[PDB]
C-alpha cells in the first residue's frame, strides 16, 4: 500500500475509504445517545457514505454458496477502484444503502436499486 508500488489512483482511493470509516467510528457513541439527526450537515453526508462503503466491501464467495444460495463473484482491481472512487466522489448519493450489500462490481449496485 505505497504510491511507488500501486500508483496514486489506488493509493488515494484506499486512503479516502480509511478516512471516511475512521471518522464514522469516532461518531458511534454520539449516534447511540443522541441519534443521527443531531450531527452537522457535513458529518451526516460522511456517515451516509461510510454506511455505503461499509456495505460495498461485502462480497458473495464461490465457496460460501452452500451457506446461503447466492452465486459467487470475482471483482477485478479496476472495478474495485472505480466503485469506491465513485462512492467517495458522491456519484451514488441517490441510491439506497441496501443496494451495495452482497453485489460484486459497482454496476450491480445500480441494478439492485431498481427493486
Amino acid at each position: 500500500l505505497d504510491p511507488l508500488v500501486i500508483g496514486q489512483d489506488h493509493y488515494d482511493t484506499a486512503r479516502g475509504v480509511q478516512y471516511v470509516l475512521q471518522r464514522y467510528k469516532e461518531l458511534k457513541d454520539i449516534i447511540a445517545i443522541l441519534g443521527m439527526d443531531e450531527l452537522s450537515e457535513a458529518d451526516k453526508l460522511l456517515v451516509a457514505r461510510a454506511r455505503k462503503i461499509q456495505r460495498f466491501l461485502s462480497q458473495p464467495f464461490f465457496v460460501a454458496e452452500v451457506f446461503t444460495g447466492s452465486p459467487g463473484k470475482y471483482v477485478s482491481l479496476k472495478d474495485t477502484i472505480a466503485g469506491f472512487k465513485g462512492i467517495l466522489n458522491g456519484d451514488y448519493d441517490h441510491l439506497p444503502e441496501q443496494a451495495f450489500y452482497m453485489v460484486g462490481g459497482i454496476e450491480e449496485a445500480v441494478e439492485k436499486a431498481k427493486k
Binding site: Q18, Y19, L21, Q22, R23, E26, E38
Partner: protein
C-alpha cells in the same frame, strides 16, 4: 504499523550531508524487512554514511540481547574522537523479550510481568552512553591529537505498545530514562495525519537549545498552542457561535494541524521549514482554505526556490535570523499571494 521505522529511517537519510555518522540496529526483525530498509537507504543515497547491525528473528537470543550494545560501541568510536553520530534501536521491546528468555532459562527469579528484576538497568546502561562530551574529554581520549572539538552520540530508541497501553513494565522504564518522547497515535494515522505525532503527549526536555535561531523564534509556543486547540475543538464542537478570541484560536489551530502533515522520503531543509512556519505564525494562511494549505506550501516553496534562491542559501548556512531576513521573507510571501 503507524510509522515508527519510517520516522527513524527518514531521520537517518537526512544526515547524508549533515556530517553526522549513522547506525541502524535491527533487533528481532525478519531478514527481508532488514533488506528493504537497506534498499531504501541505498535508494536515498544514505547507505554510504550508515552502519547496519542485524540480529534477525531466527538468531540466538544472546545475539539479539547484545546487538544494541555492539551498535552503541560502533557509534561511540566517533563520539570519543570529536565527531557526531546518530543511533537507531528499531525495537528495544524485542531486546527486552530476548533478555527475559535468557534470564528465565538461567532460572533467575522473575518480576512485574515475568521480566527479570534488572530489566530497567538493561536499558539505562545502554541509553546513558548517548551523550555530548567536552573538549577536555576528547583532548584526553585522543592524547592531544584532536583539540577544541566536542563529540556526541544521539539516540532514537523505538518502543511498541499493545493497544496504547503505556502502563506496561518496559515502556514505563524507558519513558523514565530518555530526554523526551514522540508519541504516534493510530486514530490520527487512520484520520490521514500521517506523521501521526500527538503534540499534547510528545515532549522534548532540551527544547529551544536544540534549535537554530530561525526555527527557535518561528516555533516558540506552537506545541502548547496545538495542545490547547485540540481541547478547544472538542469543547466548542456542538456549542453556538463564540467570540473573536475563540474563532481566531480555532481557525489558526485547524491550519497548523493541516500544515504539520508530510509525506515519507520527502525531508525539508531549514529554509523550507522556515517559510512554512513563517507563513502560518505571521498570519499569511488566514485567507487560505484548509483544503488548500498543502498546495499553498508546495507552491510557495517552489516559488522561493526559483525567485529567491540566494535567500534560501543564506538561511541554510547556520539557520540565522535578523530584520533583513524577516523583511526578505515577508516581501516574497506578499508578492507570492498577490500574483499566484
Amino acid at each position: 504499523q503507524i510509522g515508527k521505522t519510517a520516522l527513524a529511517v527518514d531521520a537517518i537519510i537526512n544526515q547524508k550531508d549533515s556530517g553526522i555518522k549513522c547506525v541502524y540496529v535491527a533487533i528481532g526483525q525478519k531478514q527481508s524487512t532488514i533488506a528493504n530498509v537497506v534498499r531504501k537507504l541505498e535508494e536515498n543515497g544514505a547507505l554510504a554514511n550508515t552502519i547496519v547491525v542485524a540480529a534477525s528473528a531466527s538468531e540466538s537470543a544472546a545475539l539479539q540481547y547484545l546487538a544494541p550494545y555492539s551498535g552503541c560501541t560502533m557509534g561511540e568510536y566517533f563520539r570519543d574522537r570529536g565527531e557526531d553520530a546518530l543511533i537507531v534501536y528499531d525495537d528495544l521491546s524485542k531486546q527486552a523479550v530476548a533478555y527475559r528468555q535468557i534470564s528465565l532459562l538461567l532460572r533467575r527469579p522473575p518480576g512485574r510481568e515475568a521480566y527479570p528484576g534488572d530489566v530497567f538497568y538493561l536499558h539505562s546502561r545502554l541509553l546513558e552512553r548517548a551523550s555530548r562530551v567536552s573538549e577536555e574529554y576528547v583532548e584526553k581520549f585522543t592524547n592531544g591529537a584532536v583539540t577544541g572539538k566536542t563529540g556526541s552520540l544521539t539516540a532514537l530508541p523505538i518502543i511498541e505498545t499493545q493497544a496504547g497501553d503505556v502502563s506496561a513494565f518496559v515502556p514505563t522504564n524507558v519513558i523514565s530514562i530518555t530526554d523526551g518522547q514522540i508519541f504516534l497515535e493510530s486514530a490520527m494515522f487512520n484520520s490521514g495525519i500521517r506523521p501521526a505525532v500527538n503534540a499534547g503527549i510528545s515532549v522534548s526536555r532540551v527544547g529551544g537549545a536544540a534549535q537554530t535561531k530561525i526555527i527557535k523564534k518561528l516555533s516558540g509556543g506552537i506545541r502548547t498552542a496545538l495542545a490547547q486547540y485540540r481541547e478547544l475543538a472538542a469543547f466548542a464542537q456542538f456549542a453556538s457561535d463564540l467570540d473573536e478570541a475563540t474563532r481566531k484560536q480555532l481557525e489558526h489551530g485547524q491550519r497548523v494541524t493541516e500544515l504539520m502533515k508530510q509525506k515519507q522520503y520527502a525531508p525539508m531543509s531549514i529554509a523550507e521549514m522556515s517559510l512554512s512556519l513563517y507563513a502560518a505564525e505571521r498570519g499569511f494562511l488566514q485567507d487560505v482554505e484548509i483544503a488548500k494549505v498543502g498546495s499553498f506550501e508546495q507552491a510557495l516553496i517552489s516559488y522561493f526556490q526559483r525567485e529567491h534562491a540566494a535567500l534560501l542559501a543564506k538561511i541554510n548556512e547556520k539557520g540565522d535570523f535578523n530584520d533583513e531576513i524577516d523583511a526578505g521573507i515577508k516581501a516574497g510571501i506578499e508578492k507570492f499571494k498577490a500574483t499566484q
